[PDB]
Amino acid sequence: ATTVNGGTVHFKGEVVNAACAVDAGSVDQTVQLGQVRTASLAQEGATSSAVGFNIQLNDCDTNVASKAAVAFLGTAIDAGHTNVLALQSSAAGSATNVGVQILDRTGAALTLDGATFSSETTLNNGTNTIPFQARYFATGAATPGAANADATFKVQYQ
Amino acid sequence: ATTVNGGTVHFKGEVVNAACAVDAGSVDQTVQLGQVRTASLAQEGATSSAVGFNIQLNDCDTNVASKAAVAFLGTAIDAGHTNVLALQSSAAGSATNVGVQILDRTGAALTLDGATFSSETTLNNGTNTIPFQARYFATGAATPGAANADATFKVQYQ
Amino acid sequence: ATTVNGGTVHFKGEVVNAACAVDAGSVDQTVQLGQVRTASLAQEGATSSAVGFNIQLNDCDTNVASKAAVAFLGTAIDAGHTNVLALQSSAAGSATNVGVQILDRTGAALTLDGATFSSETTLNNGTNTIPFQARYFATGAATPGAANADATFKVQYQ
Amino acid sequence: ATTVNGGTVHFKGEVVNAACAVDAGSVDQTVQLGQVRTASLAQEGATSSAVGFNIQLNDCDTNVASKAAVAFLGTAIDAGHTNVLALQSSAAGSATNVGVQILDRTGAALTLDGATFSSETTLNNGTNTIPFQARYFATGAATPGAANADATFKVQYQ
Amino acid sequence: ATTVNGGTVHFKGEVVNAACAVDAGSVDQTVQLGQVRTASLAQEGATSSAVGFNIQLNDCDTNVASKAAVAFLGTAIDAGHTNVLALQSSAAGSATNVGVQILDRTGAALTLDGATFSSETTLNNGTNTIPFQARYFATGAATPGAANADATFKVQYQ
Amino acid sequence: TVNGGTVHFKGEVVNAACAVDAGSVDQTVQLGQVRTASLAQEGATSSAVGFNIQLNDCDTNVASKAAVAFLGTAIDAGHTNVLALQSSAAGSATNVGVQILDRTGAALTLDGATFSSETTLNNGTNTIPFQARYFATGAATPGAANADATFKVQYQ
Amino acid sequence: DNGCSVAAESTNFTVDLMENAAKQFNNIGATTPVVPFRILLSPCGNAVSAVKVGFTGVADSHNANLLALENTVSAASGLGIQLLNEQQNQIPLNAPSSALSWTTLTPGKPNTLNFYARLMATQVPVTAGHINATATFTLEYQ
């Protein structure tokens, strides 16, 4: 009977010529690092506790590539810290002298350039979960404020 | 004391004469299908897995209409495949020989002409959820690239 | 003395004119089916073992309604099998020729149309528990992959 | 080797002599009200449900100002209804006898003239969030059509 | 060998100058109130049962502050009921004459003002948990609908 | 009626490795709102807002790395990396300018020829991150702080 | 005096469209970032009120509203120069004087009129090469 205007739906995806495919819940995810005290980040090199996230690969094939690595691209805090990611919340109220650091399964910080790939993990025929961690890193004496960032990643199969 | 120009708020909505009102999250949604390999889409009629989404209708009255059906409208990928939706061509680097296919609650693909309503779902007073799905359909041998798409739906109450 | 901001709390609920109220843990629950060998799902009609889940109804009044039934709604695997729920997961790495069947108190699979209701269970004042089961159903020869699915239920009181 | 023209980027912002700074996501925001029924808005004074939108104030210094208020400005639907906001004109057809009514944290409508500020909210140091609600208000018997609106707001710091 | 685009990751957090840090699971949490019946909320001032939610503070230093209190901010329902939260889901299909109400560790309703703090809880070094409850308060004869409400809290240290 | 004059047009269509996304060719970056207390002295910078230039249909057999060079109006001599603000009818902020950083956190020179750090490319979709701040050349003044800068992509 | 004079700078000037990615023209109608150019009208009298600026030249075969490109051995094909206005609205080539849009001026002062130019694909894929083109601008005074 009555026909209504309804609404709209947008589909977001990508087709890749690769051994695996990145999961729908992993292509875009939000990681809640929580909240950190300025006392925990009080001097150069101080790190907070790490919140663990992971990237899921579906439809993997070991006859095409038996190992996978992930490379991260983002804005470094400065030229002296190429593995720390700057905070880009807004133009006011962001924290100072602190940036998010990303660690692979080896517990080592990753360079944010898109060309330094992490430690290669062996794949299964099927679902594979690659674990990562994210913490806060003080490039000085941290100050109160919002601490949000954003980084892109790419996957290399060998 | 100090009055400062803050900003602007834009309110978007629609008054409709119907039995139900589409939810604020369903009138405009962004479903993320995720990545898919070209091996799964290497031949005509090859379909990837189907991600699930749903449309929520609030304030339903069964004294004026006890069933609902949803019809989607979009750009068909070609004349032959009228139920396969074309990919956004507003930019370069899009996947070829592949489109997105919307499935009703019966599991069958829906013709995207705006006048073919899906299977009727019985309604109850209150909140109603109608489940749909979206997958990838290969009209040939797929090639890598972005696979975003878009559709607009209308609701019929009986 | 020192006031900071903590975060956000979102409350989700529903007010219903009924005889029983669905429990807070039953309005949204995750069922862990486990994993099944593809040898068990070798041909069409092959079924796996069943896990059990319950819907709990609180604050029941037998002076309003003495019996309760539950109907499920979801996307069927195909037109032939209307009682077999279709796997959703992501757009890659999902099991082929496999769905999930929901069985009611009597051990009979329920069609997922939203209007076919299960066997009525007699209600008592207070707390009632309606048991259901979930298993896998092979529409062909199963293939490895994720086997997640979703459905939404609806309660009728008589 | 191949320098190609890329395009342009426009940066929008504002420097203010205030005790707080309106968030980047709050300076211009889009509140999706959803859909409403003509039956729900059938007489003068009949109001729909309310959606919630928040105004965030980053980098707040309480030594400068301890409380904040927000005053909205927009075109009124009639002279009699000064707290109701007129809808924009639409090519397909806009709804009549209905507007948008903004409520503050006390659940009271706000006069949309730019001089009547809402109830004062106590601010902390740093991130602050002021909740508001948008609601449909029927000035008569509402008719179907798109119901879009816009309102500019200013912030006062005591 | 094969390098493909993976996607993006968003990191969210905040650096605070406080004795404790709000947990990653507490900075943004969802409480499932369940379903309630209009028969229960059939009169003004009639309440429902209460569900419990906790706010967890990490890395607490009792030398800095020995007590903590929490204040909640949100849209009230009426001028008379300042401690009852207003429902905000969409522009249609919400319960009428009812709102969420938050209770501190003394079992008393909290004014949703941003300045009336809850009963102080003594803090020990390390992890602390602050209990809270949420129920439904009816400002009249309640009507069926979806009852979702949101609030933001501040934590005061002494 | 008047013959006027002749306008010549020169240019080249080259085989570039990628193509700037239709979103990225013209994008508006909502920096937000800043306080004069934050921008209170020479060299004082506000917090950064991130924006991305997305490239599509990239081919690594044509070019394996990409860089972006920005061109804009400098606020002053000696502040070539600080972009001048546009003028508004009500008024614009003085002693404030938009500053565009790089993927290494270093502000770019808005000359149109000082390219940014080169990012390696993968076949398909690539994304180049950038950030924007408010750089103060003195005591800031309230007002609208809008600016605009063009950019060019060097595939190497 | 309702008539203005074209300065030596605006008598003959070249608009540099720079290098353009052949991949940017995915489909017919794909454009490029606009390149601004200006026409200085000075001196002007105290009676000038409006000027309509029209563009004339050899039009493209596929699109009659696009300025054509010279066909040589090493010239790009499948493209056409789209000339816009101050508000980025299309100004058709060889359009009649009634079809144009009046532009306001300021009497007694050197007035600068700003327009834009870009490339629009008429064929896919767009071939590579150079883009040499000439147009003649005419002025209708009011």
Residue numbers in the entry:
A (entry chain D), B (entry chain C), C (entry chain G), D (entry chain B), E (entry chain E): 2 to 159
F (entry chain A): 4 to 159
G (entry chain F): 13 to 154
From the paper:
We determined the cryo-EM structure of the transition from the last tip fibrillum subunit, FimF, to the first turn of the pilus rod at 3.1 Å resolution. The structure revealed key interactions between FimF and the first three FimA subunits (FimA1, FimA2, and FimA3), which are well-resolved and clearly identifiable. In contrast, the preceding subunit of the tip fibrillum, FimG, appeared flexible and was only visible at lower thresholds, highlighting its dynamic connection to FimF. Specifically, predominantly hydrophobic interactions were found between FimF (complemented with the donor strand of FimA1) and the donor strand of FimA2, while the interfaces of FimF with FimA1 and FimA3 included both hydrophobic contacts and hydrogen bonding. Notably, superimposition of the first three FimA subunits revealed a conformational shift in the βC-βD loop: while solvent-exposed in FimA1 and FimA2, the loop in FimA3 adopts a different conformation that enables interaction with FimF through five additional hydrogen bonds. These interactions are stabilized by hydrogen bonds between Lys35 and Gln36 of FimF with backbone carbonyl oxygens of specific residues in FimA1, including Ala20, Asp60 and Val23. Importantly, the chemical identity of Lys35 and Gln36 is conserved across FimF homologs of other chaperone-usher pili at the transition from the tip fibrillum to the rod. However, Arg38 and Gln36 are shifted by a few residues when aligned to sequences of other FimF homologs, consistent with the substantially different orientation of adjacent FimA rod subunits compared to the FimA-FimF interface. Thus, these differences in the interfaces and the simultaneous interaction of FimF with FimA1, FimA2 and FimA3 are likely incompatible with a FimA-like orientation within the helical rod and thereby facilitate the transition between the linear tip fibrillum and the helical rod architecture. Models of the tip-to-rod transitions in F1C/S pili, F9 pili, P pili, and Yfc pili show that all FimF homologs point upward in a manner similar to FimF. This underlines the critical role of FimF homologs that function as adaptors aligning the tip fibrillum with the axis of the pilus rod.
